[PDB]
C-alpha cells in the first residue's frame, strides 16, 4: 500500500499517512491488548505416538 501510494500520490500525503498510521497502530494495539501465556501455545500430543 505504501509503495502504491508513493507511486500515485506523492511525498507529503505519504508522510501524513505514515505518521497517522504509526499513531493509529499504537491506538489499536493499546485497544486490543491480546496477551500471551503458556496456554497460548497448545502442543499437539500426536507426536507422542508418532515419534
Amino acid at each position: 500500500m505504501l509503495n502504491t501510494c508513493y507511486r500515485i500520490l506523492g511525498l507529503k500525503p505519504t508522510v501524513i499517512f505514515a505518521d497517522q498510521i504509526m499513531y493509529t497502530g499504537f491506538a489499536y494495539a493499546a485497544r486490543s491488548g491480546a496477551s500471551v501465556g503458556i496456554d497460548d501455545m497448545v502442543i499437539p500430543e500426536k507426536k507422542h505416538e508418532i515419534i
Binding site: 508513493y6 511525498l11 498510521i21 493509529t24 497502530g25 499504537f26 494495539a29 485497544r31 486490543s32
Partner: protein, 151 residues
C-alpha cells in the same frame, strides 16, 4: 543563572534551528538524519519510531551523534538533503524505506480481522459513527459482515 529568558531564547533560536542525529556504527547512508529538534526533559534522545530500522539499532544502549549546521549552506544542505522528510525509499535498491515493522502493522492487521462474527456483526452503516459505536458499544473489529456505504 539560567533565567527563563535564556530558555525562551534557546527555544526561539532552535525553533528555526533543526539538528542532525546519527548512529555510532556506520553502515548505510540512513545512519544520519536531520530532524527538527524539540526540547526534552529527559536524558537520552527519543527518535521517531519511523526510522528505527534506518538507524540499524533496536532500542538498545547507544549514544548518537549530534550535528549543528553552523554554515547557512550547512543548514540548507541538511534540511534539503539530509532531511529524513526527504529520505523515503531505501536508496540502495530503491525500495521504500519507510515501512512500519513494529506493532503498528500488528494493529493494522488486528483492525481488519474478525474471528467469526462478533456482537452486532450484521449491523449496517455509513461511516461517521462506527468509532462512536466501537469505542462505547454496538460493534467490534472482531465482527464480520457489517455492511457499510463507502465513499
Amino acid at each position: 543563572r539560567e533565567e527563563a529568558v535564556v530558555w525562551d531564547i534557546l527555544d526561539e533560536v532552535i525553533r528555526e534551528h533543526p539538528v542532525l542525529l546519527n548512529r555510532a556504527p556506520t553502515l548505510h547512508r540512513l545512519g544520519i538524519q536531520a530532524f527538527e529538534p524539540v526540547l526534552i526533559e529527559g536524558k537520552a534522545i527519543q527518535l521517531h519510531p519511523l526510522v528505527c530500522a534506518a538507524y540499524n539499532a533496536d532500542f538498545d544502549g547507544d549514544q548518537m551523534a549530534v550535528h549543528v549546521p553552523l554554515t547557512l549552506e550547512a543548514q540548507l544542505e541538511a534540511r534539503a538533503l539530509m532531511m529524513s522528510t526527504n529520505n523515503i525509499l531505501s536508496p540502495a535498491n530503491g525500495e521504500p524505506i519507510i515501512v512500519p515493522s513494529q506493532d503498528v502493522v500488528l494493529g493494522l492487521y488486528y483492525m481488519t480481522r474478525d474471528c467469526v462474527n462478533a456482537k452486532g456483526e450484521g449491523m449496517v452503516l455509513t461511516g461517521p459513527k462506527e468509532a462512536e459505536r466501537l469505542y462505547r458499544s454496538g460493534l467490534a473489529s472482531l465482527h464480520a459482515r457489517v455492511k457499510v456505504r463507502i465513499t
